[PDB]
Every structure is written in C-alpha cells, then in structure tokens.
Amino acid sequence: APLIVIVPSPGMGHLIPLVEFAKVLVSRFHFSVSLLLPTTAQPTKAQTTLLNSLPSSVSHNFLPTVDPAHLPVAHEVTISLTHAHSLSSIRAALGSLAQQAQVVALITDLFGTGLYTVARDLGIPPYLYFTSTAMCLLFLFHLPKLDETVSCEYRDMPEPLVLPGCVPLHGKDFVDPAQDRQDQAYHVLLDHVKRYVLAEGIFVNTFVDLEPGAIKTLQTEDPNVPPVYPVGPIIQSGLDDDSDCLKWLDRQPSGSVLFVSFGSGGTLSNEQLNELAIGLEISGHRFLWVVRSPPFGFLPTGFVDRIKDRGLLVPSWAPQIKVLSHGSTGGFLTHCGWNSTLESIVNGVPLIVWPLYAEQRMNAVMLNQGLKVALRPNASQRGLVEADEIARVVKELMDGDEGKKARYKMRELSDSAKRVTSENGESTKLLSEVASKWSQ
Template identity: 55%
Template sequence: MEQKPHIAILPSPGMGHLIPLVELAKLLVLHHDFRVTCIIPIIGSPSKAIKEVLQSLPPTIEHVFLPPVSLEELEGQQPGIQISVTMTRSMPSFRDVLKSLVATTRLAALVFDVFSSDGLYVAKELNVSPYIFFGSNALVLSLFLHFPKLDESVSCEFRDLPEPVKLPGCIPIHGRDLVSPVQDRTTEWYKLFLRNTKRLRLAEGIMFNTFMELEGSAIKALEEEAEAGNLPLYPIGPIIQTGSTNQVDGSESESLKWLDNQPSGSVLFVCFGSGGTLSVDQMNELALGLEMSRQKFLWVVRSPNNESPSASYLSDQSHDKNPLAFLPKGFIERTKEQGLVVPSWAPQAQVLSHGSTGGFLSHCGWNSTLESIMQGIPLIAWPLYAEQRMNAVLLAEDLKVALRPNVNGKGLVDREEIAKVVKDLMVGEEGKKVQNRMKEVKIVAEKALSTNGSSTRTLSELATKWINHHDF
C-alpha cells in the first residue's frame, strides 16, 4: 500500500464542475503532498476539452473514466436533470473504483460537488470521509443550506414573493433572482434540487470557492450556524484554472494577436462561459448594441438557441460549426476595425490577463467571475442560468464590481441599453468606480491566497485534519 495520503475526487459532468476540482487537486498535490484520483462520470464520450484538461495534469493526479451513461430518453431535458441522472446511473461503477482505492491506497477523503451527492452514501458505506466542494460563493451556499426550511415556510412560487429573501449576512435577493431550479416548484428539477440541498448537512465538511475578504459577513453568519450544527466550513477560494500545457492553436493565437494590436485597457471581452447561449433575437441586439457603442470588443460567438440559455452546457463545443452565420448581415464587415468575432471558444484566461482587455461582459458563472477578479477586470453582469442571477446581484449591488443592464418588457436587453452600459463601463464615470473597486478586490483576493492568507491557512488546516485523521 502506498504511503502518501490519497484523495478521491468525483466531479459531475460539465467543464465548469471539473476545472475547480482539478485545480483543488493540484493544490493538494503541490502544497500538501497528497496523491489524487479523479473519478470521471461521462455522458456519451469525453469531450476534447475534458481530455486536454486531464492530460495536462501532473503524474500524481490520476484519472479514471467511469463507463459512459446513455441519456437518449432525456434528450432536451434541463442539464441539471441530465447531470443528476448521470450521477445516479454511474454509482455502481463508481462504487467499484472507490472500493479498489480503499483497498490499495491510504484514502483520506472523497471530495465531490453538489450534483454528485449520490457519492456521499457510497463513501459512508465504505467508511470514507465525504467532503463537498461547493464551486460557488457564500451567498449561494447560504441559499442551499437554508433551502429545506425555505421550502417549508414559503407557500407560493419564490418568484411571486412580495419581499426579497433575506439570508443571514447576505444582500437580500428577490425570488426571481434565486437559482434556476427553484423558479417552478412543480418540476422534477425542483425536487432534485431540494433533495441535493438536504444532503449537504450529511457531509463531514464543505469547502467553498470564495474567501473571507470578499464575503466576510456571509461567511461568518454561515460559520456560526455551522458550528451549532457541527458542519465544518472551509472558504478556500479563489480557485481558478491555472496554466494549461496546451499549445495555442489557430483560433487562440488569432484572438491574442488581435489584442496585441489594441490600445491598453480598450477592449471589452464578451463571452458567456462554456455553456451559455442567447436567443436569435438577443444575439442580434447584442451585435447591434456592441456596434452602436463604438467601443472595441472581442466576442466569442456561439450559435443561438431559442429554447434554453444553458443549451451548450453538456455539448461538445467543437461541433458548433458556423455560429457566425447568425450575426446581422454586414456586421463583421462593418465592425472589422472595431472588434473581433471568434466562433465558439477563446483562451479566456489569457484574454483576461492581456493588457488590452479593460472589461468583461460575462454570464456571471462563478469560475469566470473569479478569473475576472484575479485579473482586476470589471464586469457587465449578464446572467443566463443556474445561480448566475444571484451572482449578478452580489457583483453589481453588493460588491459593486459590475454594471447590470436592464431587461425590457419582452425579456430582451435591447441594443440601446447594451450600447449605453458598454460605454458606461469602458469610458464612463460609473465604469471608473467599478474599475477602482475591482482593483481593490483583486488585491484582497491575492492576499487570501498568499502564504499566510486566509484561504491558504484554511486549506492547510483541512489537509492536516485529513492526514491526522488516518494517522499516516
């Protein structure tokens, strides 16, 4: 049996779930001398992007793909439902892998995300300590932990509540801005969400991807409650994607070369994450709004989808053949001096760290938000699905590092509003304020990750606990 302490990691499907857990694995390997096995459930076959992430890992982080799950009968269902069903169907093969790790390694803990909570019962059965990695912030974690009680105390739909929901230590949130699954209480998705929130308190601890200096009052309120309920909480963020070893390919180098030729801080990066899609009408308004703003932009364009804003979340982006065909006629020609449009994907980390980038129009996925914070880039908050509306409220109203455009009566952000908000962020007084505030947040984020920083100390405390727990 190997001597080093070992951690098993179980991410649910989706790049946004895999990347922060893989980055956590790197920290445990580099700073605390653990070995890690990533156990990867898949729908169909693993995408090129997932394979690239796993192939770039150090040898002390191994990975095992579980047998693929078929979801043909769930075609068109919410990604959240598809993910939950995938995890449930993957449990027999997951149990076999975990059992083998228990027999051959000094397994200190299983770390899994909130969608993988089926794994909690397998861990308990095999006498492995289960820990949740919650990939979002303290505001959203607070909603999850309080949700079973909210479900009992609120009788109407949350979106119809006359007053905002007040979570301890957090900015009040209107029901319509709560996470997507709770927007219709009659659905299967709602029932799955409620089930997952009830399971959180069965773990031996919860790590979450934020830091004391960002959300101090929310974290303190959570910790006070957690102590009473004997549930240790570990704010260990910001954990973001670090240096992939991939070579820069054609589409990447085109973006970066174009940025090299733009003035410092002049470009707005427009990207809706690994899964966000706009409707046909909204894509049209965004194009015309960017053009009207006369500000420089680098826009990652994905084919529109009128059914769901999360339509791309579980799809392989390399299959999105010609998204540029959906842009308004003549748009690319008219804006060739003003902006660059790239299909499907751009090297986000490199774009955000580039000196020419001065703003980020984002879907407010938490991974993207933390990347923006670490580069000090102010935001235009454009939430689409999952917990992104809550993130947008946190960023625009509480932290004041983002501007948020208004939606019109048809549910669209129209071109005039887009042009106005883009100009406000890039060259307006309002933009200067959020830019300065974001610079302050960047400084405290770096401090949290420094040798003696709050998040570094918290992760060390947890690593020590895992090592001592098994007397390695």
C-alpha cells in the same frame, strides 16, 4: 503517498473546477488523486484531452456506462440519477482503492451527496467542493425552511429574501431549479441540500474579503451546518494552446477593450446577437467578442467591416485568462458563471452582468447591488436587451463614473485575491490546515 478520491458529476462545468482543485492538492501537498467519473456516454474528445493533460499524480477512471435507455428532463435530475445508478460501481471501485492504498478523503460536488454515508461506512471522510458562492451555499442551506415558510412560486413573493449578511434577493433571481416547485429538479435539489449536513467539511471557491457576511453566517448561524473552508480563488493558470487575440490586444490602449463572452452553454438568439453587434458598434468602444453561432454571415449587413478598426470577432473560443490579464482589457460582458467571475476578480476587470442560467441571476445581483463591481443592462418586455441599452451600459462601464467606481472596487477585490492566495494568505493557510489532517 496518501490517495484522495474525487467523484465529479458528469458535465464539463462540474469536471473542470474539480480537476483544478486536484491540480492544487497535488502541487501544494504530498497527495495522489484518482478521479472516478460516472458517465451517461463513452468519453468525449474534450474529456480525454483535459484528463490526459494532468500531472502523473492524478489518475482517472470512467466508470461503467449507466444505460441511457434506463433513464426515462432537467440536467439536475439526469446528474442525480447518473450518481444513483453508479453508486454500486463507485462502492466497488472505492473498496478496491481502499485495500491497495491509504484513501484519506473523498471529494464530490453538490450532486454527489449520495456517497457521503458510503464513504463514512468505509472510514473515508467525505467533503463537498462547492463551485459557486458562499451566498449560493447559504441560499441552499436555507431552502428547506424557505420551502415550508413560503407556499407561492418564489417569483410571486413581492418581498425579497434577506439572508443574514447578504444583499436582498427577489425570488425571480433564485437559482433555476427553484423557479418551478412542481418539476422534479426542485425535489432533487432539496434531497441533496438535506444531505450537505453529512459532509466532514465544505470547501467553497471564494474568500473572506469577497463574501464576509455569507461566510460569517455559514460559520456561526448553525451547529447543523458542517465546517466551511473558503480556499479560493482557485482558477485555471491559462498556459495552454492559443489566436490573433493577444497580438490584437497589444495594439490597443490601456483599459480600452470590452471583452464579450457568454460561455460554451450560454446560447443567444440570432435576433439578440444582432442587437449586441449594433450595440457594440454604436458604443464607439473597442471590443473583443467571442461570437458563438445563433463564419459571421448571420451578423448585421456591413457590421464586420464597419468595426475593423476597433473590434475583433473570435469564432467559438478565446484564451479567457490571457485576455482578462492583458492591460488593454477594461471590462468583461459575462454570463456571471462563477469561474469566469473569479478570473475577472483576480485580474481587476469590472463587469457588465448578463445572467443566463443556473445560479447566474443570483451572482448578478451580488455583483451589481452588493459588491458594486458590475453594471447591468435593462431587458425590454419580451426579454431582449436592445442595441441602445447595450451602448448605454458599455459607455457607462468603459468611460462613465459608474464604470470608474466599479473598476476601483474590482481592483481592491483583485488585491485581496492576490493576498489571500499568497504564502501566508487566509486561503492558502486554511487549505493547508485541512489537508495536513489527511497527511497522517
């Protein structure tokens, strides 16, 4: 069986999507997968749980530790230097796999582009698995031209960027590493983007119906850009441990529950949690809120008790796909991470977008002004979203006209998602087309 080698950037939001692509490759086709994981530290309990739960066709190997004493900032820079200081270990690992097996492809994420020429030299075609939007991919291919054209900090550009086929995008909403052009994170992002051109091909976790403009543009605007393969949505099945969540959702009316979840990495002040609480309470709507610390002793006096009839508080973790696919679930207050967004898209659940970091501000603008499947609260001057504003937008989503229009549009995207991933769907077919070229 041909071997595919996958090199994830260190960190769980890099590993989980590439593990998901791995599960897809080995279920749908006759391939084995070897994950080579560069690491700043010894395996986590979280990494070992995820990795030891995979089918036997997916092996894994933590590479020799890069000494964290010999890395003197932003996570983009740390990721990049981990890849660089692991180049030798990967070349060595890759050399040995290549002689003991037929290595037909290398797959990396958007920070593994240092491996592309290494893979080419060894007769292995390298692919980029882009875990965010086609719009975000287009933004990044355009960034070097933007960097020359515009000399001010992007937030100071009073006019929006209008990429062909895409919603206008103010500079304040550009990805995080583009918000300080003096930080090294900006320079590393440009270096990696400049090498996307070295990929045999770029998989994108999206589909034609979701982003027709950015995909049309990516696939026609430039010969310089490699082939681009929309093969999504690819999402976790959610058939794993856990949780009174489902028992509780069963007692609620159809489309009546607002699921509220900022991810693992999405951190809110105690002041902002307490405004969210009062806001949920005074909305009058039913909610399931994954409450992460700023058990519920820091929450507004009396709140836990006053919402016993209409809201469930869950510490730390909920079964997201099980919640989102339940008929009680009417909405999702999310930080707009792409994997959460895709889960919500395939289950027809419309959103309130509350972006926190990475490319989330760009996802919010796409979801809110482009696809019109999301509402958005307004922050006050200091950046705090006030209880009264949370209540207003919760009511708009769960019972208002804007919510009805969003729910309708999101149910249409839901139907496209099901179609494009079915036996004869555009996404199933395209990935089969690319994989079959490896099979020989």
